[PDB]
Amino acid sequence: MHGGATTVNISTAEWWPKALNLDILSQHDRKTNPMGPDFNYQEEVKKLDVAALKQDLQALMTDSQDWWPADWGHYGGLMIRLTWHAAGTYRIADGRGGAGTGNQRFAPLNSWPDNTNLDKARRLLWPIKQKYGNKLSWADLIAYAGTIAYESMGLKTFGFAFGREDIWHPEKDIYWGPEKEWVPPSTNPNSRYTGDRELENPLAAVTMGLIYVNPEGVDGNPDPLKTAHDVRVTFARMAMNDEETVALTAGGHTVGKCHGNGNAALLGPEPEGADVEDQGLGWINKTQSGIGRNAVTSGLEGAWTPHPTQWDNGYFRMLLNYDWELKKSPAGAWQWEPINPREEDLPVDVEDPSIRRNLVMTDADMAMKMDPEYRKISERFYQDPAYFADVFARAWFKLTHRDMGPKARYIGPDVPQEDLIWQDPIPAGNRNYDVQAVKDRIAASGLSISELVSTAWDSARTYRNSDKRGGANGARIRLAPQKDWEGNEPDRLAKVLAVLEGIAAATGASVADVIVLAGNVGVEQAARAAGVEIVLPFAPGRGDATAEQTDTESFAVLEPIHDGYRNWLKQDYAATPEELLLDRTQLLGLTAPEMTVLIGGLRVLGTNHGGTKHGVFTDREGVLTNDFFVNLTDMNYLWKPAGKNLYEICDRKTNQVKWTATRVDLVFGSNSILRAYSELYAQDDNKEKFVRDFVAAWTKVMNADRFDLD
Amino acid sequence: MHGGATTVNISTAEWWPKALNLDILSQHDRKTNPMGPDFNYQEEVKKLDVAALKQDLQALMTDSQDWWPADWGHYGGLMIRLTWHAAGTYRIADGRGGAGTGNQRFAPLNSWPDNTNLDKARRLLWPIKQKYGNKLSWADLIAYAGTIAYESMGLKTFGFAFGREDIWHPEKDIYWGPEKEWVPPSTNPNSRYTGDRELENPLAAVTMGLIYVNPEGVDGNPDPLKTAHDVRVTFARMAMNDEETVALTAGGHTVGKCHGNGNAALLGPEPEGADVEDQGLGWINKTQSGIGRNAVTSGLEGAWTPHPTQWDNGYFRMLLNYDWELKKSPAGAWQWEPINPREEDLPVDVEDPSIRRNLVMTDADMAMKMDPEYRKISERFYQDPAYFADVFARAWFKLTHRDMGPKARYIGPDVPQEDLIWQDPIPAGNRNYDVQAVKDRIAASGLSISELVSTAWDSARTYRNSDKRGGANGARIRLAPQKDWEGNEPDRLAKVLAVLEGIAAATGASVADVIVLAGNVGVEQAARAAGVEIVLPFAPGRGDATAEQTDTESFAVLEPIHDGYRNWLKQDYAATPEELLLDRTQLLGLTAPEMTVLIGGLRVLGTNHGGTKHGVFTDREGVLTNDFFVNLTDMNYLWKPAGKNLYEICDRKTNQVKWTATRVDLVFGSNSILRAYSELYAQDDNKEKFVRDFVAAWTKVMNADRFDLD
Ligand code: HEM
Ligand code: HEM
Ligand SMILES: NNC(=O)c1ccncc1
Ligand SMILES: NNC(=O)c1ccncc1
Ligand SMILES: NNC(=O)c1ccncc1
Ligand SMILES: NNC(=O)c1ccncc1
Ligand SMILES: NNC(=O)c1ccncc1
Ligand SMILES: NNC(=O)c1ccncc1
Ligand code: NA
Ligand code: NA
Ligand code: NA
Ligand code: NA
Ligand code: NA
Ligand code: NA
Ligand code: NA
Ligand code: NA
């Protein structure tokens, strides 16, 4: 027998399941990235022959492959379902999920029950990926496929942007929910539901391994009105309102079908569970024909429209004009079928068009008819189909781009020139100003180091790499709702902004550029106070966004209700402060060593929310030294718990309290990885490395949102 | 609630526990390494003030700290136990474990029950680490501490080498055993024992969380003769024979004591389980005094010698001259105490020397008296103490250096000039020869590409980064036992060596240098055959080792009984072929993208063991192309299992068998990470990237053991 920890279960994880998952900070690194260190996907994708790609992708739609034949000779429905599921994992609370990384090709998502047979759809796109190569990411390809499908089936799509860079392993940072089985009912142990069927907060799906809701009803029990409530809830958590939700649902089901003509128990394991002979595919039926008319996917069986290969007004025509009742598909799934349909409305067999099959609606489709608010939108869409096609095209674009970040990241010839509000638009800022002059005015203000640093931190800290929202570009901190957020210390913030707005007015640098420049100046002073002279790198050009281009409600999810870096917690939460710091740090894109130096430096700069002294382990606040680490690692002190999220650092000999500290401070001296970092920075020889690393991490955070730069 | 996978249990690991643990290949990367990319510990440690360090470390031995006072005012015993436990995790079967990485400061090892209170010992060394900084790794410091302790307590140690570079997280590649509890009896479910109490093979300890054996007896039942069997077995798996084993045991227990004066149930959680207030420490007693005379560590209580602060002949004097019986320590542990000791032989209280305490022996100590083979060595050591001190000093040096690799890695002023056989010595090879001339002779031989490449691969593939043994330096492939290993294809190997020995003789390049140069030539030709002209980088200087300096039995553990890279398996094993490939790849130091290109390239070069065609998915064998990937990713084929570790690749349309393949081949098309890599290399635009990456990986492997270079 061999001594390799060679399968995934063998681990430290079993022994101390509560430990911080620091691995989420060291993802997507060089040893996993198979590309050269100078590869730049954005510059490559700019060279892609898009017109040629569009042509090949359109041709693929009607180029049936015999190992997974196209329904009616057209892969369009499959491809739209692929792209909808790719995008459909997004959620607004943390920005995680979405189509922006091509994550559907990796675990767990490649093997979710809701993604059954999308393994074949991905595989069908391989010859195109093979052809266009490094200039076409799987992520962009997967995001594009359904858009091209809509074009080929007769819908005028609103546009498309390239620019999604591929990843090479699962996104380990994404918590998909608490369950340890696929699609368990909402009364299971480990439920994602609390209280009065309230869906726990980051989550945007009703159960583990579904995209949004259960097509058969809540917990598998048909009831259109309860299904509607779940639809409304899950879709809102994916940034969509009633109109967008009805449009998306109807528009999706205007094409394609449900596959459930066989026995679902005969499908082989999902892809991560299948053995090598299945070619990275899953759900393979080796007992009977599992393809064409015998395909089984969701278990429901039928098409929503008479002509599932084309964009039309079939969906509301069927739904609204027929009356419907519950039936069981051949695989045993609940579905709705129409009472007394006409022959001529029956969709035909996917292999032989001389045979007629059946129409179907899911519980979510029936919701669009029975929920009184959806019913109104549905009737509008049936009576005004041009409006329907417009709203649908726009919502489909939003769906597939909502995690792409600012328009500065978008590439390609079909990028819409409109600025949509959900792109959080920001104009280009003037770059032709004297930086030094601005710095001199900042220094000559009487704003302290702590005011300066806290304000620039608070402006940048909202950035999240999950969907590329937030950050210092735009100076949205000066606008509603940010300017009144409790974590942002609105009085201190109003005080600093009054000054810095004056400076911006006077110099023609944006308020955004000045906020950042000012934090640089506070850091610079703090270093100078330690006898270190440095100038921090600085890139001008940030714009100031307007209130008109700032969706107030959509910014709610970026509010800092916790920020370990300023020892801030708005309330007492169930998660530990240090887990919350890890989460925020992962969204900022920071590594564990970065996280560590930032904490130590921010602490000694005197930047804690409320001017608290927790973790301020220095006799010289305002001076950028490694004191935090020196003192944290000093065994002349013992640490005594002193209530909620608080500790006394006491002298072992005198039994006097020297400092206080929170769990955010003390984890850097407790966790064995973080203390190893703390010890490195507390070494006699690493005072200058500490400053230099602090600076580099500061700068990283100030520039996180600068996609406008090249 | 927040959407971060923020604690270690949240994972893909739960869902598909059988999946390959590819993370073990992407360890110790840039995002975890807090040092600058140009930091080089070897060049820094060369600048360390060793004499000053020796002085500080010696002073620490008698610089008692009040939070964990030194027994009798001397930390020596604690520090030797620290260093022995650090080194004592080594095992020969895979080279994993040992003191060579400073792993004791990270999970799981920092919290093993056998490492109780070594958290305090590590902490006590922090002020020295803080002082010497980046020029002194925690790894070297921990390895050195016990050596300096022995010096200060009167023993002439044999020497010491610096050069162990620190790591920054647990070694995820090390499988420590199957149990999910600490120290369970050998009849538990999940036992590491098979058959007739046969210890499963990589493992070198009798249970989970112990270093070697149970000090209270087998499964906690005292019986010196059964304890002896476990001692003999575990120590042999750590490279030590009877003489070294008795010397180590006696020499360790010549100093220090067992701590068990209290109740073990009152000790707080081990370090990874303790909360933030414990300062990364563990086992803290908050209910009563847990320090000094009230310390509890193993639960046994007493010292082996009258004078535990000094090197002497107390150990065999006590053991051999007193008769012993079983008693229970105050913590409730079984131990041996002497019948009728004299007052004057009783070790005194650790805080107050006017109080006498007790002598003790463990079951392993009694083994040294009762096992008939140990008894003889013990009497030799008692009658010849100079011999004892010599053997012990040498074995202690071996213990602490056995995973350091060749002497070329050793640094510092106390490196022994002797070449010990366990360092696998190799001389410097002549570097002043004409490389091209050698290449021309190789090319003009009639040795094929496959002979050339296979032979260089087989010479290098034995390298393992766990203990830095093996590799192409030394040309030990031409010697016993390697030249007759079945995986090395001894006839083909004898045929190639006859030629290449001739070339080496003729040119004054070592046989080692020529073996590698020859593989480069085979690769070069193969590329030329594809119309690509490259010259592979090459570093001369390898030596040819002698039989006299090659310990035949110790090389047994490097035999290639499996090597996916040449589609080789010596027998049918319980582990899957792909898990075995992952293990080997991790020991070679390769990343997953490296592993991937190496497989594809080796396959098309025609290098499989036995000249098999499994995975040879080309019509042009001998030509270095990306054909393997092109064909592997082609859905014109289906894959049919065809017995053990074998598959047929069949044309979907004709149902004819086109190629055959093993699991090692097909996992690269099945695993979702590996197929993502396979697809990258099968892209129309990546023929040259494939060759270039192949070459870079080839070169990496050929140079893995070249510590002689700078
Ligand atoms: C609102 C909740 C939704 C539910 C419960 C739902 C449910 C389903 C189900 C059960 C299938 C059948 C899958 C199969 O068996 O092959 C399916 C197919 C599909 N859905 Fe949805 N859907 C929803 C929303 C959407 C949206 C928002 C889109 C796109 C805008 C979409 C587009 C599609 C398409 C194109 C197919 C056809 C697949 C094919 O022809 O292969 N659906 N839907
Ligand atoms: C052969 C099996 C061995 C067993 C079962 C064993 C067992 C133990 C036990 C139970 C303790 C007491 C720990 C405590 O309660 O503080 C201990 C202490 C120690 N052992 Fe071993 N030991 C073994 C081999 C070794 C070796 C090979 C070395 C070094 C060459 C060593 C050196 C020490 C030292 C120095 C201490 C004293 C710790 C102190 O004074 O704080 N032992 N041993
Ligand atoms: N063999 N296939 C059928 O008879 C069938 C197809 C679709 N819905 C119901 C039945
Ligand atoms: N259920 N059948 C399939 O998923 C399949 C059929 C043929 N080749 C690959 C996959
Ligand atoms: N319980 N429902 C499912 O397992 C399922 C749902 C949608 N597609 C496939 C399977
Ligand atoms: N309080 N400590 C004792 O009485 C003791 C110390 C060591 N062995 C036995 C007893
Ligand atoms: N059992 N007691 C201890 O481990 C300890 C005592 C004082 N400070 C730190 C640790
Ligand atoms: N069962 N034995 C133990 O748990 C143990 C052994 C050695 N040191 C501490 C604890
Ligand atoms: Na790389
Ligand atoms: Na996202
Ligand atoms: Na239609
Ligand atoms: Na330094
Ligand atoms: Na780094
Ligand atoms: Na090792
Ligand atoms: Na002694
Ligand atoms: Na290329």
From Swiss-Prot, chains A, B:
Cofactor note: Binds 1 heme b (iron(II)-protoporphyrin IX) group per dimer.
Entry cofactors: heme b
GO molecular function: catalase activity; heme binding; metal ion binding
Post-translational modification comment from the UniProt entry: Formation of the three residue Trp-Tyr-Met cross-link is important for the catalase, but not the peroxidase activity of the enzyme.
Claim: Heme is one of the keywords in the record: yes
Swiss-Prot/TrEMBL site (Transition state stabilizer) positions: 81
Single GO BP term: hydrogen peroxide catabolic process
Binding site for heme b: 253
Residue(s) of cross-link: Tryptophyl-tyrosyl-methioninium (Tyr-Met) (with W-94): 212-238
Catalytic activity annotation: H2O2 + AH2 = A + 2 H2O; 2 H2O2 = O2 + 2 H2O
Keyword vocabulary terms for this entry: Heme, Hydrogen peroxide, Iron, Metal-binding, Oxidoreductase, Peroxidase
Catalytic machinery residues: 85
UniProt key word Acetylation: no
InterPro entries: Catalase_peroxidase, Haem_peroxidase, Haem_peroxidase_sf, Peroxidases_AS
Annotated signal peptide: none
Pfam families on file: peroxidase (PF00141)
Cross-link type Tryptophyl-tyrosyl-methioninium (Trp-Tyr) (with M-248), residue numbers: 84-212
Activity sensitivity to pH: Optimum pH is 6.5 for catalase activity. Active from pH 4.5 to 8.5.
A GO-annotated cellular component: cytosol
Complexes and interactors: Homodimer.
Similarity field: Belongs to the peroxidase family. Peroxidase/catalase subfamily.
Physiological role: Bifunctional enzyme with both catalase and broad-spectrum peroxidase activity.
NCBIfam families membership: cat_per_HPI, PRK15061.1
The name this protein goes by in its record: Catalase-peroxidase
Originating species: Synechococcus elongatus (strain ATCC 33912 / PCC 7942 / FACHB-805)
